């Protein structure tokens, strides 16, 4: 991954 | 006056972008999570790969240590969190309840509760020993980008793309305060004394908030941050700094009091998504994205  | 961080180790091993770095409280290791579905443990002092922790079915956006450094928790797109035994490497519990990507996570200082934040916009509070969801908070009207407990575990701060930070009562679930312009908040955490909260927004700005007086005391700028939920840090071991990743590939260090940039760490070849400060030594670990895929360890005299 989300954050990526 | 100014720190002098210098490159010591580049740690390689993750095959996709690194999502977050966290030094264990006992100062010995560093844990990293990554889009490659893996948690990796490294030596804090030597930069040596210790082990890989796997089991998640999709990527991992966050990882956090328990207070005695015995446990990890990880937040995955597979809609779950996992509690890991750091020594055995094995998955102790799987926390199921979220209805979408799990994005952020943390233990309370006591480390018998876990807080999580999700793209289903809830903040959940889990019992570490049984694995049950004790509370679900409909916390935001946008995905939750950070959760954090305070020095005594009584408070939880959370932030969101909706532009608000919200402080919660761990025990009741009640919302205690809300900080408000209002650009997306990509990260928040309490200061170590728990009196202020540090908030990152997607308008290239870190703000330091007096939590109780609900007002903004200091703002730090100069870095690039418009897309990613980048981790920010209080550095307390030497000089008192604000530390943070940046979308121009640098690590930024600010003087907490004067708001001036005191150092920029060059070396990464992609967005620095995550930085972390060592418990006792003047050491910063930084991690970068798909074009880099490495964690770097830097050390300073102050």
From Swiss-Prot, chain B:
<feature type="site" description="Important for interaction with histone H3">
    <location>
        <position position="290"/>
    </location>
</feature>
<keyword id="KW-0007">Acetylation</keyword>
<dbReference type="GO" id="GO:0045815">
    <property type="term" value="P:transcription initiation-coupled chromatin remodeling"/>
</dbReference>
<feature type="cross-link" description="Glycyl lysine isopeptide (Lys-Gly) (interchain with G-Cter in SUMO2)">
    <location>
        <position position="16"/>
    </location>
</feature>
<dbReference type="GO" id="GO:0000123">
    <property type="term" value="C:histone acetyltransferase complex"/>
</dbReference>
<keyword id="KW-0677">Repeat</keyword>
<dbReference type="InterPro" id="IPR001680">
    <property type="entry name" value="WD40_rpt"/>
</dbReference>
<keyword id="KW-0805">Transcription regulation</keyword>
<feature type="repeat" description="WD 5">
    <location>
        <begin position="181"/>
        <end position="221"/>
    </location>
</feature>
<dbReference type="GO" id="GO:0006357">
    <property type="term" value="P:regulation of transcription by RNA polymerase II"/>
</dbReference>
<dbReference type="GO" id="GO:0051302">
    <property type="term" value="P:regulation of cell division"/>
</dbReference>
<dbReference type="GO" id="GO:0001501">
    <property type="term" value="P:skeletal system development"/>
</dbReference>
<comment type="similarity">
    <text>Belongs to the WD repeat WDR5/wds family.</text>
</comment>
<dbReference type="GO" id="GO:0042800">
    <property type="term" value="F:histone H3K4 methyltransferase activity"/>
</dbReference>
<feature type="repeat" description="WD 6">
    <location>
        <begin position="224"/>
        <end position="264"/>
    </location>
</feature>
<dbReference type="GO" id="GO:0044666">
    <property type="term" value="C:MLL3/4 complex"/>
</dbReference>
<dbReference type="InterPro" id="IPR019775">
    <property type="entry name" value="WD40_repeat_CS"/>
</dbReference>
<dbReference type="GO" id="GO:0042393">
    <property type="term" value="F:histone binding"/>
</dbReference>
<dbReference type="GO" id="GO:0051726">
    <property type="term" value="P:regulation of cell cycle"/>
</dbReference>
<keyword id="KW-0539">Nucleus</keyword>
<feature type="modified residue" description="N6-acetyllysine">
    <location>
        <position position="82"/>
    </location>
</feature>
<dbReference type="GO" id="GO:0071339">
    <property type="term" value="C:MLL1 complex"/>
</dbReference>
<dbReference type="GO" id="GO:0140109">
    <property type="term" value="F:histone H3K4me1 reader activity"/>
</dbReference>
<dbReference type="GO" id="GO:0072686">
    <property type="term" value="C:mitotic spindle"/>
</dbReference>
<keyword id="KW-0853">WD repeat</keyword>
<dbReference type="GO" id="GO:0140672">
    <property type="term" value="C:ATAC complex"/>
</dbReference>
<comment type="subunit">
    <text>(Microbial infection) Interacts with herpes virus 8/HHV-8 protein LANA1; this interaction regulates the MLL1 histone methyltransferase activity on viral DNA.</text>
</comment>
<dbReference type="GO" id="GO:0005654">
    <property type="term" value="C:nucleoplasm"/>
</dbReference>
<dbReference type="GO" id="GO:0045893">
    <property type="term" value="P:positive regulation of DNA-templated transcription"/>
</dbReference>
<feature type="repeat" description="WD 3">
    <location>
        <begin position="98"/>
        <end position="138"/>
    </location>
</feature>
<dbReference type="InterPro" id="IPR015943">
    <property type="entry name" value="WD40/YVTN_repeat-like_dom_sf"/>
</dbReference>
<keyword id="KW-1017">Isopeptide bond</keyword>
<dbReference type="GO" id="GO:0045995">
    <property type="term" value="P:regulation of embryonic development"/>
</dbReference>
<dbReference type="GO" id="GO:0140004">
    <property type="term" value="F:histone H3Q5ser reader activity"/>
</dbReference>
<dbReference type="Pfam" id="PF25175">
    <property type="entry name" value="Beta-prop_WDR5"/>
</dbReference>
<dbReference type="GO" id="GO:0044665">
    <property type="term" value="C:MLL1/2 complex"/>
</dbReference>
<dbReference type="GO" id="GO:0006094">
    <property type="term" value="P:gluconeogenesis"/>
</dbReference>
<feature type="site" description="Important for interaction with histone H3">
    <location>
        <position position="77"/>
    </location>
</feature>
<keyword id="KW-0945">Host-virus interaction</keyword>
<comment type="function">
    <text>Contributes to histone modification. May position the N-terminus of histone H3 for efficient trimethylation at 'Lys-4'. As part of the MLL1/MLL complex it is involved in methylation and dimethylation at 'Lys-4' of histone H3. H3 'Lys-4' methylation represents a specific tag for epigenetic transcriptional activation. As part of the NSL complex it may be involved in acetylation of nucleosomal histone H4 on several lysine residues. May regulate osteoblasts differentiation.</text>
</comment>
<dbReference type="GO" id="GO:0045722">
    <property type="term" value="P:positive regulation of gluconeogenesis"/>
</dbReference>
<protein>
    <recommendedName>
        <fullName>WD repeat-containing protein 5</fullName>
    </recommendedName>
</protein>
């Amino acid at each position: 991954x989300x954050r990526x | 006056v100014k720190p002098n961080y210098a490159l010591k180790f580049t740690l390689a091993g993750h095959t996709k972008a690194v999502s977050s770095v966290k030094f264990s409280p006992n100062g010995e290791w560093l844990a990293s999570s990554s889009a490659d579905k893996l948690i990796k443990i490294w030596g804090a002092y030597d930069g040596k790969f210790e082990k890989t922790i796997s089991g998640h079915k999709l990527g991992i956006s966050d990882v956090a240590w328990s207070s005695d450094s015995n446990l990890l928790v990880s937040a995955s797109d597979d809609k779950t969190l996992k509690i890991w035994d750091v020594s055995s490497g094995k998955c102790l519990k799987t926390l199921k309840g979220h209805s979408n990507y799990v994005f952020c996570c943390n233990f309370n200082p006591q480390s018998n509760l876990i807080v999580s934040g999700s793209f289903d916009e809830s903040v959940r509070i889990w019992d570490v020993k049984t694995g049950k969801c004790l509370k679900t908070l409909p916390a935001h009207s946008d995905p939750v980008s950070a959760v954090h407990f305070n020095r005594d575990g009584s408070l939880i701060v959370s932030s969101s793309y909706d532009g608000l930070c919200r402080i919660w009562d761990t025990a009741s679930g009640q919302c205690l305060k809300t900080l408000i312009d209002n650009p997306p908040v990509s990260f928040v955490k309490f200061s170590p004394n728990g009196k202020y909260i540090l908030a990152a927004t997607l308008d290239n700005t870190l703000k330091l908030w007096d939590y109780s007086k609900g007002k903004c005391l200091k703002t730090y700028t100069g870095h690039k941050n418009e897309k990613y939920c980048i981790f920010a840090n209080f550095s307390v071991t030497g000089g008192k700094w604000i530390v943070s990743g940046s979308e121009d590939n640098l690590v930024y260090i600010w003087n907490l009091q004067t708001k001036e940039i005191v150092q920029k760490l060059q070396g990464h070849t992609d967005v620095v998504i995550s930085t972390a400060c060592h418990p006792t030594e003047n050491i910063i670990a930084s991690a970068a994205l798909e074009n880099d895929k490495t964690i770097k360890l830097w050390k300073s005299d102050c």
